[PDB]
Design a protein around this ligand. Structure first.
Ligand SMILES: [Mn+2]
Ligand SMILES: [Mn+2]
Lengths: 352, 352
């Protein structure tokens, strides 16, 4: 149980209780997706008592739909959330563990008002080492990644008769309009794709030039991310296979496998680009981790030596010569021991 | 100058410097819209030195586009943001003012690592009293509010031939798809509009029933919000003018004017509903403040007596009998001394 891993840490670090705030961490622990926004909500795990969950007076009857179970209770706006919390917790509280990365001072200060000079302890690192592996629900990241293939389908088509980059984004987002993109959809024509602040604008697509897509979705809880780059009408030759240098992605999809550096795959790629001699230009991290957030561990930067086992991240290599001729390609992937596999199935070799 | 108001506070409270983090507060101060997301950025105002602005190594050349001016500098990922900050600030720093509401512990702790046992002071209340009045750019909230009228146009039409609530939302969002909605667009048919967790789903609209809209946009920086409720085919009579009780909104649009309670307009409304006798059901705050965020001060709750002067907020009254017959209406408005006025011009009396 994920909650049992946390009691264990509390016991092990002699901290009494948690007050958990990152709404993405909530649902990963609780299976419930709540967004209090301006209001307060926290997951309170203990060393050896029954875990509670605080909630606005309005979100509570719902939260008993997940259920697990957790002792659920709330506060109306008339009253001080921090008050309610203490008049529900019994037993004494010296330490609280919270997510440093997320919890603001308005909140720690709200607790201190009520509890006193409590030592705060950083839970964030733990949650991180817990999300780094999943294997629970890779199945969920499968369907999102598959919806991105369907996004690539709709996008390609839509580049056809005056159509601009925006039009293309807007049409993909219509789809239902399945709830939410995991990040801002990119459609970038020719030399706009080399910009390190490139964004779709209402500008016609360039015929005989390259078209980059890079997109992704939130399918209920988890997330996908991908980049295809295609040609609109017969492509340029220099451009033609700057695509090749980059499609070779495939010098790292079943080359893969657990127990190799981090300086590992950012080696089979960043070298094979200096091969054809564009080591610079390609001047950003190859690879970020993926799961419930579009960006997570592991980082796949060149420098230090994180071993790989059983992990989600992404394969985005691309060369950018400012004023170029656009190109990058990306799948996200999970590590099994095979071999391995990618979350997106669309063609790396195409033209429309 | 908004920045000059802050030095003044620093001087007045004998605090050396600010480290400002809420990216909506940045742009309100700086005219620049930056989103570092996982990364660090802060606006550093001093008592009597030249204000600086910290930025990722990647956002900086851009930030010199606004300009003002501010001393702009950054950090690559190789290096510790908190390090850079201290090796740029000279002079001694005992106190830092930050926005309690926004700044997490990972950040205060990052500062303390570098600076030492610094007293943190709460800037948030000041920024709030500063945003409560604008009059600078009401003009910007004018065009967004006008785009919401154009959203209401597109929406109405689109309720026509199998169309569901989702379809209608999706079509409005297509529009360009002018950047961003200020909040999740609501389209709710008949009895779905009474739910206090009502959300558009892929369900056909009910003929001879009510259709609520409530929507809004981000037009570059500021924001709008509105609710119209219309009829799809000849409406029910009980429903017909539960609309009347609620359209009477107009028992508070030029009744208005500065120097009356807060328990003021949540009196001309919440009574005139008990008039026809649905005081309960209508069980939420009438009125929230609006500006750069969809929700801001002033709160217009029943209880305490905030005077009005020269302020943005919204007029959303509506009765909800669970399993009802849907109805609410809302404009947002600014206080001038006339009279006053609303940001949305569409018809409060209609049927499609
Ligand atoms: Mn991507
Ligand atoms: Mn509204």
């Amino acid at each position: 149980s994920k909650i049992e891993r946390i009691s264990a840490f509390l016991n092990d670090k002699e901290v009494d209780m948690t007050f958990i705030t990152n709404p993405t961490t909530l649902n990963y622990l609780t299976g419930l997706a709540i967004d209090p926004h301006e209001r307060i909500a926290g997951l309170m795990i203990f060393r050896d008592s029954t875990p509670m969950l605080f909630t606005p007076a309005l979100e509570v009857e719902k939260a008993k739909e997940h259920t697990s179970g957790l002792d659920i209770f709330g506060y109306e706006d008339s009253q001080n959330p921090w008050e309610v919390v203490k008049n529900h917790v019994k037993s004494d509280v010296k330490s609280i563990a919270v997510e440093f990365s997320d919890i603001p001072l308005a909140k720690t200060e709200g607790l201190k008002a009520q509890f006193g000079d409590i030592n705060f302890v950083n839970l964030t690192p733990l949650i991180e080492r817990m999300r780094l592996i999943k294997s629970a629900d890779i199945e969920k990241m499968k369907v999102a990644g598959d919806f991105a293939d369907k996004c690539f389908e709709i996008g390609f088509a839509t580049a056809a008769e005056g159509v601009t980059e925006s039009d293309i984004v807007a049409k993909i987002e219509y789809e239902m309009g399945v709830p939410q993109m995991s990040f801002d959809t990119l459609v970038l024509s020719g030399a706009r794709a080399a910009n390190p602040h490139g964004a779709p604008e209402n500008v016609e697509i360039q015929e005989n030039k390259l078209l980059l897509f890079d997109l992704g979705v939130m399918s209920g809880g988890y997330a996908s991310d991908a980049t295809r780059t295609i040609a609109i009408g017969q492509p340029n030759d220099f451009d033609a296979e700057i695509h090749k240098i980059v499609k070779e992605q495939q010098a790292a999809m079943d080359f893969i496998k657990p127990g190799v550096t981090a300086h590992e795959v950012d080696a089979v790629a960043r070298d094979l680009i200096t091969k054809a001699g564009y080591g610079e230009y390609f001047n950003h991290r190859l690879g970020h981790g993926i799961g419930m957030d579009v960006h997570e561990y592991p980082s796949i930067v060149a420098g230090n030596d994180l071993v790989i086992q059983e992990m989600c991240f992404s394969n985005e290599p691309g060369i950018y010569i400012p004023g170029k001729v656009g190109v990058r390609i990306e799948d996200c992937l999970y590590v099994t021991e095979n071999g391995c596999e990618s979350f997106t199935h669309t063609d790396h070799d195409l033209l429309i």
